[PDB]
């Protein structure tokens, strides 16, 4: 699944 990550998906 080539889904885009949410704005905050990479924040702790």
């Amino acid at each position: 699944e080539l889904l885009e990550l949410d704005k905050w998906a990479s924040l702790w």
Partner: antibody, heavy 132, light 107 residues
Amino acid sequence: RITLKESGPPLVKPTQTLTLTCSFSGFSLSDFGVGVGWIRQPPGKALEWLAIIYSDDDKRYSPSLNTRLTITKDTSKNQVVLVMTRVSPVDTATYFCAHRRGPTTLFGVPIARGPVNAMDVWGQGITVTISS
Amino acid sequence: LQLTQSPSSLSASVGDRITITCRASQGVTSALAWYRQKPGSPPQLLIYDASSLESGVPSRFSGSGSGTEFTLTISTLRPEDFATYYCQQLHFYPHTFGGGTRVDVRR
């Protein structure tokens, strides 16, 4: 203290353009990382995510409805607008706007993702019917 | 991405303890919210970030899970709890809601 309210026409004819406005209070779209999203609910059915716009003018759309959708903001009026072109009767639904928190910040530093993972306050909803 | 809620419907009585499940087709970390919706009203947030209790929300509500399996729990059902519940994932775009779980008065 946060309130949102949808406005627009209750009836639109097929092929026409629907413009919905969210008017809010108790927060500012200048708040770092704040979002305003749109969600709809066809009669008798479940919630369906439509779009979201952020303080930085970052926006995202439903893939299935994305050619018909535009989302805009005026941070000084405390309003967000959703435009949906070429409406058709499938588009009959209750439309909600909603607030998304920005992350926890400490003296301006984002220190925690948590709080962003919900839509925390919703507007009451506006019923829109599409019919000729 | 698919979010699957189960059951779709369930019967219950005041004072009951109920458990609603949400599974994601792929991992969404902790980015999962639960809402209650009463007929004629907008959804109301119960739980954010999978397990965090929203301010002002009665303590009977709780949530658990991370990755793909999530559960909402109402420890003691109150009259206001006969309603429909939805989960939503906010880890990927588009954000997606589950199909809903109707909770009615058993007889």
